[PDB]
Every structure is written in C-alpha cells, then in structure tokens.
C-alpha cells in the first residue's frame, strides 16, 4: 500500500499482500486465479491474527496449523481426538449435517479431514461415522504453539486382559438345544412367565418343542424360530421380544446338501420336475393369494421372458460390470415406494411380501440421530409406479400405513444389523399386473439358490444414492431402474469392510476395479433383492437392500440384509391380529 510509486513497478504478492497491509484489489490484481484468490482471502481473514510478523503470515500460508478456532487448517488429519473415524462432511451417513459442504464451501472440505466450519467452541471437529455420537472435536494443532486444539486420547477398545473371558460356547442350531437361565432382554421389557395365564393363552395354539422345556420366565426358542430366543413381554396383546445370544456364524451358503451329486456341469433347468410352493403362512391373517407370489399376468401367465433374463447365469462373459438398464413395463410388481405424507418428499423403497403386509427398512422409519422419528400416520406407500414424477391413475395404486412392527433385534448402533420393519395397510389392494407380492425363500431354498450361482436383481429409482451419498452428477432417475448384481465370497466380504458384518447381512455385486466405482448405490434403500428361481419359475427375494459401504466408500459392493430365516417370526406378528 505504502511507497506510492509501487503501482508502476512490477509487484510481489509477498511485497504487497504479505510484508504490507494490502488491498484485496492489489490482491485481486495479482491473483486473478479467483479460486486461489478466495484461498488467499481466506488466508488473510484467518491470518487476521497472523498479519504480523512476516514469517507468521508465511506459516499461515502453509496452513498446517489451525488459527484460533481452526478456520484455516488445511492438513491431512482426518481423525477425531479419540481415534473415531471422521464422517464425510457432505454425506448424510450417519447424520445429515445442517453445517456441511453446501454451507461451508470455502473451508476446502476434503474427504474427512478435520475442520471447524462453524467456528465451533470445540475447535476443529468432525462428524463421526459412528451413529451413536453426531460430532466430536479433533485434536488439531493450533498456531503459535506446539499445542493441539483438544486432548488426544485415542479410544482403546475392550482389552482381553482386564475383563473376564466367557467360556460359554456359541449356541448352535439357532437355540434348539439351549436352556440357560438368562433373564434379561435387549430392550429391557420383562419376560412374562411362560406358565402364566397370558403366556398359556397365547401359546395354546402354538406347537412349541417338547424337547425344549418351557421354564418360567427365561428366554426360550422351542418353536424352531431361526432368529433366536424370544419371550412374551408386558403391554399390548401378543407383544414379543427377542433376547441376544451369540450364535455361531451359520452362513446359509455353507449348508452341504445331501442329495447334490458332484457332476456340476450343464446345470439342468426344471423339466418335468416342478417344485411346488409350500404355504408356510396361514391365509387368514397373512392374506389370500399367497400361492401366487411373484407371478406377473403379463409375463408369468403367458411364459413371456424379459429381455434382461439372458444374464442370469454367473457363467456369463468374463463378468464385466454391466451399466444400469431401464426396466420393462410391469416387471417390478413387488417394488414399493415409501413416500413422506407431508410435505412432498420421496423417502425410501420397500418390498411387497403379501397383499396386506409390506416390508421396509427400519432406518427409513426410526433414526433419532437423523432427526427422523416417524409414526404410523406420517408416511405412505405407492405400489405399481412407473415414473416417480408422473401420475398414471389406472395402473398404479397408493396406500396409507396403519400399523408398524419393529423387530427387537434391529441393531442400528453398531452395523445396522437386521434392517427390518413391517407395515400393515388399512385398505387392502387387490392383485394386478403391476402390483404382486414376491415369494419368500426359506433357509434350504436360499442355500440352494445361492449355491446355484444366479445373479440377484435390485429395483429402485436412485433414492438410496440421494439419501446416503452427496454424489451430484448422476441425477435421481424418475424411471424404474434395475441392476443385476451377483454374490461374492463371505470371508472377502468381511475383509472388504473395517466395520463388523453379521451373518444377517451379505455382500452382492461385482468387484469395482480401481479407476471406477461400482453401481452398488443404485436404486432405492429398503427395496428388494430378487432372483428368478430356476426350479419353480418364481422370483424369490433374498432380503432387503440395506445401507452398505457401496454408497459411502468407493471400491465396495452392495450389502443386503437377510430376511429369509424369519418365516417362524412372520406368523408371530399375525398371531397378534388373529381376532
Ligand atoms: Ca505498497
Ligand atoms: Ca500498494
Ligand atoms: Ca517497500
Ligand atoms: Ca495495481
Ligand atoms: Ca501492485
Ligand atoms: Ca520480501
């Protein structure tokens, strides 16, 4: 600024806007690169306390130290003060940040690098990937001293020395041989005495195993329910609650068939060997037409094959990843679109299991950290939709939710285990070409289909990508979209994530090679993952399209929540409504 005849000499960004109080004009004049201009401005601003001396401003230009509350820090530290992983600022997992990339673009928000966007009192902080705590301060160095902004005490997990190691063996056979005296539930609801009047009244119609004795008030699983030990709890009639037992990891794919000869070449299609559908659920409360699951009148009733079926066999051409393809008309009858009642907003996807029950992701209904706590009267569903933004009155239908059941084993605190939610419609919707329930595979059926090497199908409109990712550049498809994804190895699935994965969740999809990210984040969250069974010409839905690392992290596949074992559990719901 001073030395007036400076404006005729050539200049030095450091001999004008560093060793001297300068105009942003001379700054603008000397910079022009308006992105770095904003950067230098941000510098100046943050360096408002680093104006003097000169080397202090040089260090503030280096940016490795956070100035004051941490507005200027531009390093590479992306870890909380206690070692918790920093959540992506732009992404909504696991919390939707009111203060994020859109609100603070000038801070150079990196992948997860610790920042102080709002100049928070905790200094440079970061949102945490752990759903339990939304935010945590980062231990970022402050300028002027070799001092960090907050105490760095990394989280050491439970040790193998200071606690007592349980010698209790893992429970096999899903608890068909366990009779322990554990008497505490996961959610704390007390177990009603099995010999009491209410339990006897509720179980008189239930054929509990005679070998597994029914003790007074402990957790018992004699009904052959694969989920685990459950007990009746106080409250409304028929209330049930499941207890936590550390079952041995009983992968469905590892069931060895005792009738499969080792001649595995040229897989034989079903000819004169028709596998009939076995009704595991009573039509009275599970709904009529159960025998007609997944049978489209346009395709199944006339033996018309879709143009996308020729890719079912995993022996296809060198397993190259196939891009997204638009689905046909009427080929997605079991898809449901979970919509916000008020105001207008698309929420999630869901699977149609019966004409009067619907299956949807639990996180779409309940997520207190997400400011999301929906009652039965605040969301609706739409079945048989072709285009999201349009309304085709005749062929599509809408429904309003009445009753919601949440499985007590749904664990959103560690890994979103068992993302299960059940819904009931007050006004039933009859059968149609574009609306038809999908079949429910059992344990043996799932094992047979998975060991047959058939690809899975995921249908949706891209709402999963909108909800769990901030990737702008591929607009949300308003057209029905379908993606084919095969299965991968389970131990590799464990090695593909830094977070623990339960047996109820499995990997599916091609391996995204370096240089591109896979399409595992296509479709809608909570939607179906279906495979056309070659043994009965039917479509079996392996589970729910739940949140996976395929959205938030590149190089990952789709993680899906298994619901095939829940057959015994399913009736346990409608046994409450048998009146
Ligand atoms: Ca000057
Ligand atoms: Ca000047
Ligand atoms: Ca001078
Ligand atoms: Ca000038
Ligand atoms: Ca100048
Ligand atoms: Ca100089």
Coordinates of C-alpha atoms and ligand atoms in Angstrom, one line a residue:
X1 CA 0.0 0.0 0.0
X2 CA 2.7 2.4 1.0
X3 CA 5.6 3.5 -1.2
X4 CA 3.1 5.2 -3.6
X5 CA 5.2 4.6 -6.7
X6 CA 4.8 0.8 -6.2
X7 CA 1.9 0.7 -8.8
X8 CA 4.3 1.5 -11.6
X9 CA 6.9 -1.2 -10.6
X10 CA 6.1 -4.8 -11.2
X11 CA 4.9 -6.3 -7.9
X12 CA 5.3 -9.2 -5.5
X13 CA 2.4 -10.9 -3.9
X14 CA 4.8 -11.1 -0.9
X15 CA 5.9 -7.4 -1.3
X16 CA 2.3 -6.2 -1.3
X17 CA -0.2 -8.5 0.4
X18 CA 2.3 -10.1 2.9
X19 CA 5.0 -7.7 4.1
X20 CA 2.3 -5.0 4.0
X21 CA -1.4 -4.3 4.7
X22 CA -2.9 -4.7 1.3
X23 CA -5.9 -4.1 -0.8
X24 CA -7.8 -7.0 -2.0
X25 CA -7.7 -5.1 -5.2
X26 CA -4.0 -5.4 -5.5
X27 CA -4.6 -8.8 -4.2
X28 CA -7.2 -9.4 -6.9
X29 CA -5.0 -7.8 -9.5
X30 CA -2.0 -10.0 -8.5
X31 CA -4.1 -13.2 -8.2
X32 CA -6.9 -13.4 -10.8
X33 CA -7.0 -17.2 -10.1
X34 CA -10.1 -16.4 -8.2
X35 CA -10.2 -19.8 -6.6
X36 CA -6.8 -19.3 -5.0
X37 CA -7.9 -15.7 -4.6
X38 CA -10.6 -16.9 -2.3
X39 CA -8.0 -19.1 -0.7
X40 CA -5.6 -16.2 -0.2
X41 CA -8.6 -14.2 1.1
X42 CA -9.5 -17.0 3.5
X43 CA -5.9 -16.9 4.5
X44 CA -5.9 -13.1 5.1
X45 CA -9.1 -13.5 7.1
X46 CA -7.9 -16.3 9.3
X47 CA -4.5 -14.8 9.3
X48 CA -6.2 -11.6 10.6
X49 CA -4.3 -12.6 13.8
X50 CA -1.3 -13.6 11.7
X51 CA -0.8 -10.3 9.9
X52 CA 2.4 -9.8 11.8
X53 CA 5.2 -10.8 11.8
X54 CA 6.1 -11.8 8.2
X55 CA 7.1 -15.4 9.0
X56 CA 3.8 -15.8 10.9
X57 CA 1.9 -15.0 7.8
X58 CA 4.2 -17.4 5.8
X59 CA 3.2 -20.2 8.2
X60 CA -0.4 -19.1 8.0
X61 CA 0.0 -19.5 4.2
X62 CA 1.4 -23.0 4.8
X63 CA -1.8 -23.8 6.6
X64 CA -0.7 -26.8 8.6
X65 CA -1.8 -25.2 11.9
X66 CA -5.3 -24.2 12.9
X67 CA -5.6 -20.5 13.7
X68 CA -7.7 -19.7 16.7
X69 CA -10.8 -21.9 16.4
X70 CA -9.5 -23.7 13.3
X71 CA -11.0 -21.9 10.3
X72 CA -7.7 -22.1 8.3
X73 CA -6.4 -25.6 9.0
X74 CA -5.6 -27.4 5.7
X75 CA -3.7 -30.5 6.7
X76 CA -4.4 -34.2 6.3
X77 CA -5.5 -35.2 9.8
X78 CA -9.0 -36.8 9.5
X79 CA -9.3 -38.5 12.9
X80 CA -11.2 -37.4 16.0
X81 CA -9.4 -36.6 19.2
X82 CA -10.1 -40.2 20.4
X83 CA -9.5 -42.2 17.3
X84 CA -13.1 -42.3 16.0
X85 CA -13.4 -42.2 12.2
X86 CA -14.5 -38.8 10.8
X87 CA -17.7 -38.9 8.9
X88 CA -17.9 -37.3 5.4
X89 CA -18.9 -33.7 5.8
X90 CA -21.1 -33.7 2.6
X91 CA -22.5 -37.2 3.1
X92 CA -25.6 -37.8 5.3
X93 CA -24.2 -41.0 6.9
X94 CA -24.8 -41.4 9.7
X95 CA -26.0 -37.8 10.4
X96 CA -27.4 -35.2 8.0
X97 CA -25.2 -32.1 8.7
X98 CA -27.0 -28.8 8.9
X99 CA -23.5 -27.5 8.7
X100 CA -21.7 -29.2 5.8
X101 CA -20.2 -28.6 2.4
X102 CA -23.0 -26.5 1.0
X103 CA -23.0 -24.2 4.0
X104 CA -19.2 -24.0 4.3
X105 CA -17.6 -24.5 0.8
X106 CA -14.8 -22.0 1.5
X107 CA -13.1 -24.2 4.1
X108 CA -11.9 -26.7 1.4
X109 CA -13.8 -29.6 2.9
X110 CA -11.8 -32.7 2.0
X111 CA -12.9 -36.3 2.2
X112 CA -13.0 -36.5 6.1
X113 CA -10.2 -34.1 7.1
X114 CA -10.9 -32.4 10.4
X115 CA -12.3 -28.8 10.1
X116 CA -14.1 -26.2 12.1
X117 CA -16.7 -24.9 9.6
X118 CA -19.0 -23.1 12.1
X119 CA -16.0 -22.0 14.2
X120 CA -17.4 -24.3 16.9
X121 CA -16.3 -23.8 20.5
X122 CA -14.6 -27.3 20.4
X123 CA -12.3 -26.0 17.7
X124 CA -11.5 -28.2 14.6
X125 CA -14.0 -31.0 14.9
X126 CA -15.6 -33.6 12.6
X127 CA -18.8 -35.6 12.3
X128 CA -18.3 -39.2 13.3
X129 CA -19.2 -42.3 11.3
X130 CA -20.4 -43.8 14.5
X131 CA -24.2 -43.4 14.6
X132 CA -24.1 -43.0 18.4
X133 CA -22.4 -39.6 18.5
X134 CA -23.0 -37.0 15.8
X135 CA -19.9 -34.9 16.3
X136 CA -16.5 -35.0 18.0
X137 CA -13.7 -32.4 18.4
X138 CA -10.5 -33.2 16.6
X139 CA -7.1 -32.8 18.2
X140 CA -5.7 -30.4 15.6
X141 CA -2.6 -28.3 16.3
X142 CA -3.1 -24.6 17.0
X143 CA -0.9 -21.9 15.6
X144 CA 1.6 -20.1 17.8
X145 CA 2.5 -23.2 19.9
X146 CA 3.1 -26.9 19.5
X147 CA -0.4 -27.2 21.0
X148 CA -3.4 -29.2 19.8
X149 CA -6.9 -27.8 20.0
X150 CA -8.2 -30.6 22.2
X151 CA -6.8 -33.6 24.2
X152 CA -5.8 -36.5 22.1
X153 CA -6.8 -39.7 23.9
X154 CA -7.3 -42.5 21.3
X155 CA -10.1 -45.0 22.0
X156 CA -8.6 -48.3 23.1
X157 CA -11.4 -50.9 22.8
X158 CA -12.2 -53.6 25.3
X159 CA -9.0 -55.4 26.3
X160 CA -8.5 -59.2 26.5
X161 CA -6.8 -58.9 29.9
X162 CA -8.9 -56.6 32.2
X163 CA -12.2 -58.4 31.7
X164 CA -13.4 -62.0 32.2
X165 CA -13.4 -64.1 29.0
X166 CA -16.7 -66.0 28.8
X167 CA -16.2 -69.8 28.3
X168 CA -19.8 -70.2 27.1
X169 CA -19.8 -71.9 23.7
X170 CA -21.6 -70.3 20.8
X171 CA -25.2 -71.5 20.6
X172 CA -25.8 -73.9 17.6
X173 CA -28.9 -74.8 15.7
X174 CA -30.4 -71.4 16.4
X175 CA -31.0 -72.2 20.0
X176 CA -32.9 -75.5 19.6
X177 CA -30.6 -77.0 22.3
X178 CA -30.2 -74.2 24.7
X179 CA -31.9 -74.0 28.1
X180 CA -29.9 -71.4 30.1
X181 CA -31.3 -69.2 32.9
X182 CA -30.5 -65.8 31.2
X183 CA -33.4 -63.5 32.1
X184 CA -32.5 -60.1 30.5
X185 CA -33.8 -58.8 27.2
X186 CA -32.2 -56.5 24.8
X187 CA -34.8 -53.7 25.1
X188 CA -35.4 -54.3 28.8
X189 CA -39.1 -55.5 28.5
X190 CA -39.6 -58.1 31.2
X191 CA -40.4 -61.7 30.1
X192 CA -43.8 -62.8 31.0
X193 CA -43.8 -66.2 32.8
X194 CA -44.3 -69.0 30.3
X195 CA -46.6 -70.9 32.7
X196 CA -48.7 -67.8 33.5
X197 CA -52.2 -67.4 32.2
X198 CA -51.4 -64.9 29.5
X199 CA -48.5 -66.9 28.1
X200 CA -50.5 -70.1 28.1
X201 CA -53.4 -68.4 26.4
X202 CA -51.1 -67.0 23.7
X203 CA -49.3 -70.3 23.2
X204 CA -52.2 -72.8 23.3
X205 CA -52.3 -72.6 19.5
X206 CA -48.5 -72.6 19.2
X207 CA -46.8 -76.0 18.9
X208 CA -43.6 -75.4 21.0
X209 CA -41.0 -78.2 21.0
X210 CA -41.5 -80.8 23.7
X211 CA -37.7 -81.4 24.0
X212 CA -37.0 -77.8 24.8
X213 CA -38.7 -77.4 28.2
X214 CA -40.6 -74.1 28.9
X215 CA -39.1 -72.7 32.0
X216 CA -40.9 -70.0 34.0
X217 CA -39.6 -66.6 32.8
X218 CA -36.4 -67.3 30.7
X219 CA -35.6 -66.8 27.1
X220 CA -36.8 -69.8 25.1
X221 CA -36.8 -70.7 21.4
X222 CA -38.5 -74.0 21.0
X223 CA -40.7 -73.1 18.0
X224 CA -37.8 -73.7 15.6
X225 CA -37.5 -69.9 15.0
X226 CA -34.2 -69.3 13.4
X227 CA -33.9 -65.8 14.7
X228 CA -33.2 -66.7 18.3
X229 CA -34.6 -66.9 21.9
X230 CA -37.7 -64.8 22.4
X231 CA -40.3 -64.3 25.1
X232 CA -43.6 -62.7 25.7
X233 CA -43.5 -59.2 27.3
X234 CA -46.0 -57.0 29.0
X235 CA -48.0 -54.5 27.1
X236 CA -50.5 -54.9 24.2
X237 CA -51.7 -58.5 23.5
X238 CA -49.2 -60.7 21.7
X239 CA -46.1 -58.5 22.4
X240 CA -42.8 -60.4 21.9
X241 CA -39.2 -59.6 22.4
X242 CA -36.0 -61.4 21.4
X243 CA -33.0 -61.9 23.7
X244 CA -29.4 -61.7 22.5
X245 CA -27.4 -64.9 22.1
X246 CA -24.0 -65.3 20.5
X247 CA -24.9 -67.9 17.9
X248 CA -22.1 -69.4 15.8
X249 CA -22.0 -67.8 12.4
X250 CA -24.4 -70.0 10.5
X251 CA -23.9 -68.9 6.9
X252 CA -26.7 -70.2 4.6
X253 CA -24.3 -70.8 1.7
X254 CA -22.2 -73.3 3.8
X255 CA -25.1 -75.8 4.2
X256 CA -23.9 -79.0 2.5
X257 CA -26.7 -80.7 0.5
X258 CA -27.0 -84.5 1.0
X259 CA -28.6 -85.1 -2.5
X260 CA -26.4 -83.0 -4.8
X261 CA -24.2 -85.3 -6.8
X262 CA -20.8 -83.8 -7.8
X263 CA -21.5 -83.6 -11.5
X264 CA -21.6 -79.8 -11.6
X265 CA -21.6 -79.1 -15.4
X266 CA -24.5 -78.1 -17.6
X267 CA -27.0 -77.1 -14.9
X268 CA -30.3 -78.8 -15.7
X269 CA -33.3 -76.5 -16.0
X270 CA -36.6 -77.6 -14.4
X271 CA -38.2 -80.0 -16.8
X272 CA -40.9 -82.4 -15.6
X273 CA -39.5 -81.7 -12.0
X274 CA -41.8 -79.0 -10.7
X275 CA -41.0 -77.7 -7.2
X276 CA -44.4 -76.7 -5.8
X277 CA -44.8 -73.7 -3.4
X278 CA -45.3 -74.8 0.2
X279 CA -47.6 -72.5 2.2
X280 CA -45.8 -71.6 5.4
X281 CA -48.3 -68.9 6.4
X282 CA -52.0 -69.1 7.1
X283 CA -54.0 -67.1 4.5
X284 CA -56.4 -65.7 7.2
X285 CA -54.1 -63.0 8.5
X286 CA -51.1 -63.2 6.1
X287 CA -53.5 -62.6 3.2
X288 CA -55.1 -64.5 0.4
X289 CA -53.4 -65.4 -2.9
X290 CA -50.2 -66.5 -1.1
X291 CA -49.8 -69.3 -3.6
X292 CA -49.5 -66.7 -6.5
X293 CA -46.4 -64.9 -5.2
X294 CA -44.3 -63.3 -7.9
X295 CA -46.4 -64.3 -10.9
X296 CA -46.9 -61.5 -13.4
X297 CA -50.0 -62.0 -15.6
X298 CA -48.2 -60.3 -18.5
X299 CA -45.0 -62.4 -18.2
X300 CA -45.6 -65.4 -16.0
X301 CA -49.1 -66.3 -17.1
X302 CA -48.0 -66.4 -20.7
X303 CA -44.4 -67.7 -20.3
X304 CA -43.0 -64.4 -21.6
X305 CA -39.3 -63.9 -20.8
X306 CA -37.9 -60.4 -20.2
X307 CA -35.1 -59.2 -22.3
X308 CA -32.9 -59.0 -19.3
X309 CA -33.1 -62.6 -18.3
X310 CA -30.3 -63.8 -20.6
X311 CA -27.7 -62.7 -18.0
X312 CA -28.9 -64.8 -15.0
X313 CA -26.2 -67.5 -15.2
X314 CA -22.9 -66.4 -13.5
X315 CA -21.1 -68.2 -16.3
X316 CA -21.6 -65.0 -18.4
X317 CA -19.0 -63.2 -20.4
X318 CA -15.9 -62.7 -18.2
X319 CA -18.1 -61.0 -15.5
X320 CA -17.7 -57.4 -16.9
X321 CA -19.7 -54.9 -14.9
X322 CA -22.9 -54.0 -16.8
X323 CA -24.2 -50.5 -16.6
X324 CA -27.7 -49.5 -15.5
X325 CA -30.5 -50.5 -17.7
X326 CA -34.1 -49.3 -17.8
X327 CA -36.6 -52.0 -16.7
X328 CA -39.6 -53.0 -18.8
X329 CA -43.3 -52.3 -18.1
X330 CA -44.9 -54.4 -15.4
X331 CA -41.7 -56.3 -14.5
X332 CA -41.4 -54.9 -11.0
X333 CA -44.7 -55.7 -9.1
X334 CA -43.1 -56.2 -5.6
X335 CA -41.4 -52.8 -5.5
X336 CA -43.0 -50.3 -3.2
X337 CA -42.1 -46.6 -2.9
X338 CA -42.2 -45.2 0.7
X339 CA -43.2 -41.6 0.5
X340 CA -43.4 -38.7 3.0
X341 CA -47.0 -37.9 3.8
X342 CA -46.4 -34.2 4.4
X343 CA -44.6 -32.4 2.9
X344 CA -43.9 -33.9 -0.5
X345 CA -40.7 -35.9 -0.5
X346 CA -39.6 -39.3 -1.6
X347 CA -38.2 -41.3 1.4
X348 CA -37.2 -44.9 0.6
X349 CA -38.0 -48.2 -1.1
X350 CA -39.7 -51.3 0.2
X351 CA -40.6 -54.8 -0.7
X352 CA -44.1 -56.3 -1.2
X353 CA -44.4 -59.6 0.7
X354 CA -48.2 -60.0 0.8
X355 CA -51.4 -58.2 -0.2
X356 CA -51.8 -56.9 3.4
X357 CA -48.2 -56.6 4.8
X358 CA -45.3 -54.6 3.5
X359 CA -41.6 -54.8 4.4
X360 CA -39.4 -51.7 4.6
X361 CA -36.1 -50.6 6.0
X362 CA -36.2 -49.7 9.7
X363 CA -33.8 -46.7 9.3
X364 CA -36.3 -45.1 7.0
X365 CA -38.8 -45.0 9.8
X366 CA -36.7 -44.6 13.0
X367 CA -33.4 -42.7 13.3
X368 CA -33.3 -40.4 16.3
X369 CA -29.7 -39.1 15.4
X370 CA -31.1 -38.3 11.9
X371 CA -33.9 -36.2 13.4
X372 CA -36.1 -38.9 11.8
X373 CA -38.8 -40.4 14.1
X374 CA -41.8 -41.4 12.1
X375 CA -45.1 -42.7 13.5
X376 CA -47.5 -44.9 11.6
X377 CA -49.5 -41.9 10.5
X378 CA -46.7 -39.9 8.9
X379 CA -45.7 -41.9 5.8
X380 CA -47.5 -43.6 2.9
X381 CA -46.6 -46.1 0.2
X382 CA -47.1 -46.3 -3.5
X383 CA -47.2 -49.6 -5.4
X384 CA -47.1 -50.2 -9.2
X385 CA -45.5 -46.9 -10.1
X386 CA -43.8 -46.4 -13.5
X387 CA -42.5 -42.8 -13.3
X388 CA -41.8 -41.0 -10.0
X389 CA -42.7 -37.5 -11.1
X390 CA -45.8 -38.6 -13.0
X391 CA -49.2 -40.0 -12.0
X392 CA -50.7 -42.8 -14.1
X393 CA -54.0 -43.2 -12.3
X394 CA -55.3 -46.5 -13.6
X395 CA -52.4 -48.9 -13.3
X396 CA -50.7 -47.7 -10.1
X397 CA -52.1 -47.6 -6.5
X398 CA -51.4 -45.8 -3.2
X399 CA -51.8 -46.8 0.4
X400 CA -51.6 -45.3 3.8
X401 CA -49.8 -47.1 6.7
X402 CA -51.7 -48.1 9.8
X403 CA -49.5 -50.4 12.0
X404 CA -45.7 -50.8 12.2
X405 CA -43.8 -53.6 13.8
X406 CA -40.1 -53.3 14.6
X407 CA -38.0 -56.4 15.2
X408 CA -36.2 -56.1 18.6
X409 CA -33.0 -57.5 17.0
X410 CA -32.7 -54.5 14.7
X411 CA -29.3 -53.1 15.8
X412 CA -28.6 -49.7 14.3
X413 CA -26.0 -48.8 16.9
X414 CA -23.1 -50.9 15.6
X415 CA -23.6 -52.0 12.0
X416 CA -27.3 -51.5 11.0
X417 CA -27.9 -55.3 11.6
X418 CA -31.3 -56.7 10.7
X419 CA -32.7 -53.6 9.0
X420 CA -36.3 -55.0 9.3
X421 CA -39.6 -53.1 9.6
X422 CA -43.1 -54.5 8.9
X423 CA -46.1 -52.4 7.9
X424 CA -49.8 -53.1 7.6
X425 CA -52.3 -51.4 5.2
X426 CA -55.8 -50.5 6.4
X427 CA -57.4 -50.8 3.0
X428 CA -56.1 -53.9 1.0
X429 CA -55.1 -53.6 -2.6
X430 CA -56.1 -56.5 -4.9
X431 CA -53.9 -58.3 -7.4
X432 CA -52.9 -56.6 -10.6
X433 CA -50.2 -56.9 -13.2
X434 CA -48.0 -54.1 -11.8
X435 CA -48.7 -55.0 -8.1
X436 CA -48.0 -58.5 -7.0
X437 CA -46.2 -59.9 -3.9
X438 CA -42.8 -61.7 -4.2
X439 CA -42.1 -65.1 -2.8
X440 CA -40.2 -65.7 0.4
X441 CA -37.3 -68.1 0.4
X442 CA -36.5 -70.3 3.3
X443 CA -33.1 -71.5 4.6
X444 CA -32.8 -74.5 2.4
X445 CA -34.2 -72.7 -0.6
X446 CA -31.8 -69.8 -0.1
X447 CA -28.9 -72.2 0.2
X448 CA -29.9 -74.0 -3.0
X449 CA -30.4 -70.8 -4.9
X450 CA -27.1 -69.2 -3.7
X451 CA -25.1 -72.4 -4.5
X452 CA -26.7 -72.4 -8.0
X453 CA -24.8 -69.2 -9.0
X454 CA -27.7 -67.0 -10.0
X455 CA -27.5 -63.2 -10.1
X456 CA -29.7 -61.0 -7.9
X457 CA -31.9 -58.1 -9.1
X458 CA -32.3 -54.8 -7.4
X459 CA -35.1 -52.4 -8.4
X460 CA -35.3 -48.7 -7.5
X461 CA -35.3 -45.1 -8.5
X462 CA -32.0 -43.9 -7.1
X463 CA -33.3 -42.7 -3.8
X464 CA -30.6 -44.7 -2.0
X465 CA -27.9 -42.6 -3.7
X466 CA -29.7 -39.4 -2.7
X467 CA -30.2 -40.4 0.9
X468 CA -26.8 -41.9 1.7
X469 CA -24.5 -40.1 -0.8
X470 CA -23.8 -36.5 -1.9
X471 CA -22.6 -37.6 -5.3
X472 CA -24.0 -34.9 -7.7
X473 CA -23.6 -35.6 -11.4
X474 CA -25.9 -38.5 -11.9
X475 CA -29.5 -37.2 -11.4
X476 CA -32.0 -39.3 -9.5
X477 CA -33.8 -41.5 -12.1
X478 CA -37.5 -40.9 -12.2
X479 CA -37.8 -44.1 -14.3
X480 CA -37.9 -47.6 -12.9
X481 CA -34.3 -48.8 -12.8
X482 CA -33.0 -52.4 -12.4
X483 CA -29.4 -53.6 -11.6
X484 CA -28.1 -57.2 -11.7
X485 CA -25.6 -58.0 -9.0
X486 CA -24.1 -61.4 -8.3
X487 CA -22.7 -62.7 -5.0
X488 CA -19.1 -62.7 -3.7
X489 CA -17.2 -64.6 -1.1
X490 CA -18.1 -64.2 2.6
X491 CA -14.6 -64.0 4.1
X492 CA -13.7 -61.5 1.4
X493 CA -16.9 -59.7 2.4
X494 CA -15.6 -59.5 5.9
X495 CA -12.2 -58.3 4.7
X496 CA -13.9 -55.7 2.5
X497 CA -15.0 -53.6 5.4
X498 CA -13.5 -52.0 8.5
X499 CA -16.8 -52.5 10.4
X500 CA -18.1 -55.8 11.7
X501 CA -20.6 -57.6 9.5
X502 CA -23.2 -60.0 10.9
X503 CA -24.4 -63.2 9.2
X504 CA -27.8 -61.4 8.6
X505 CA -26.0 -59.1 6.1
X506 CA -24.2 -60.3 3.0
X507 CA -22.2 -58.9 0.0
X508 CA -23.6 -58.9 -3.5
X509 CA -22.4 -57.2 -6.7
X510 CA -19.3 -57.1 -8.9
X511 CA -16.0 -56.0 -7.6
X512 CA -15.4 -52.4 -8.7
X513 CA -11.9 -52.4 -10.1
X514 CA -9.7 -49.4 -9.5
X515 CA -10.4 -46.4 -11.7
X516 CA -14.2 -46.6 -11.3
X517 CA -16.8 -47.1 -8.5
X518 CA -19.4 -49.7 -8.9
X519 CA -23.2 -49.2 -9.3
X520 CA -23.9 -50.7 -5.8
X521 CA -25.6 -47.4 -4.8
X522 CA -28.3 -47.6 -7.5
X523 CA -32.0 -48.0 -6.7
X524 CA -33.8 -47.2 -3.5
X525 CA -32.8 -48.2 0.0
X526 CA -35.1 -50.8 1.6
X527 CA -36.0 -52.2 -1.8
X528 CA -36.0 -55.9 -2.8
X529 CA -33.1 -58.1 -3.9
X530 CA -34.8 -60.7 -6.0
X531 CA -33.6 -63.8 -8.0
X532 CA -35.7 -65.7 -10.5
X533 CA -35.7 -69.3 -9.2
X534 CA -35.0 -71.8 -12.0
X535 CA -36.7 -74.7 -10.1
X536 CA -40.2 -73.3 -9.9
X537 CA -40.3 -70.3 -12.4
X538 CA -40.7 -67.9 -9.5
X539 CA -38.9 -64.8 -8.1
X540 CA -37.5 -65.2 -4.6
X541 CA -36.5 -62.1 -2.6
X542 CA -33.3 -62.9 -0.7
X543 CA -33.8 -59.8 1.6
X544 CA -33.8 -56.1 1.9
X545 CA -31.5 -53.6 0.1
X546 CA -30.0 -52.0 3.2
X547 CA -27.2 -49.5 3.6
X548 CA -23.8 -50.7 2.6
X549 CA -20.2 -49.5 2.0
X550 CA -21.0 -49.4 -1.7
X551 CA -22.5 -45.9 -1.3
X552 CA -20.2 -44.1 1.1
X553 CA -16.9 -45.7 0.1
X554 CA -15.5 -46.4 -3.4
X555 CA -14.4 -49.9 -4.2
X556 CA -17.2 -51.6 -2.3
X557 CA -20.3 -53.7 -3.3
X558 CA -23.9 -53.8 -2.1
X559 CA -24.6 -55.0 1.4
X560 CA -28.0 -56.6 1.8
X561 CA -30.0 -57.6 4.9
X562 CA -31.2 -61.2 5.1
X563 CA -34.8 -61.9 6.0
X564 CA -35.2 -65.5 4.7
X565 CA -34.9 -67.1 8.1
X566 CA -37.8 -65.1 9.6
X567 CA -40.6 -67.4 8.5
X568 CA -41.3 -68.6 12.0
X569 CA -41.1 -65.0 13.1
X570 CA -43.5 -63.8 10.5
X571 CA -46.5 -65.7 11.9
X572 CA -45.6 -64.4 15.3
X573 CA -46.7 -60.9 14.1
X574 CA -50.1 -62.0 12.7
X575 CA -50.8 -64.2 15.7
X576 CA -51.4 -60.9 17.4
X577 CA -54.1 -60.0 14.9
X578 CA -56.0 -63.3 14.9
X579 CA -59.2 -61.7 16.2
Ligands
LIG1 CA1 3.0 -0.8 -1.2
LIG2 CA1 0.3 -0.7 -2.9
LIG3 CA1 8.5 -1.2 0.4
LIG4 CA1 -2.1 -2.3 -9.3
LIG5 CA1 0.9 -3.8 -7.2
LIG6 CA1 10.4 -9.9 1.0

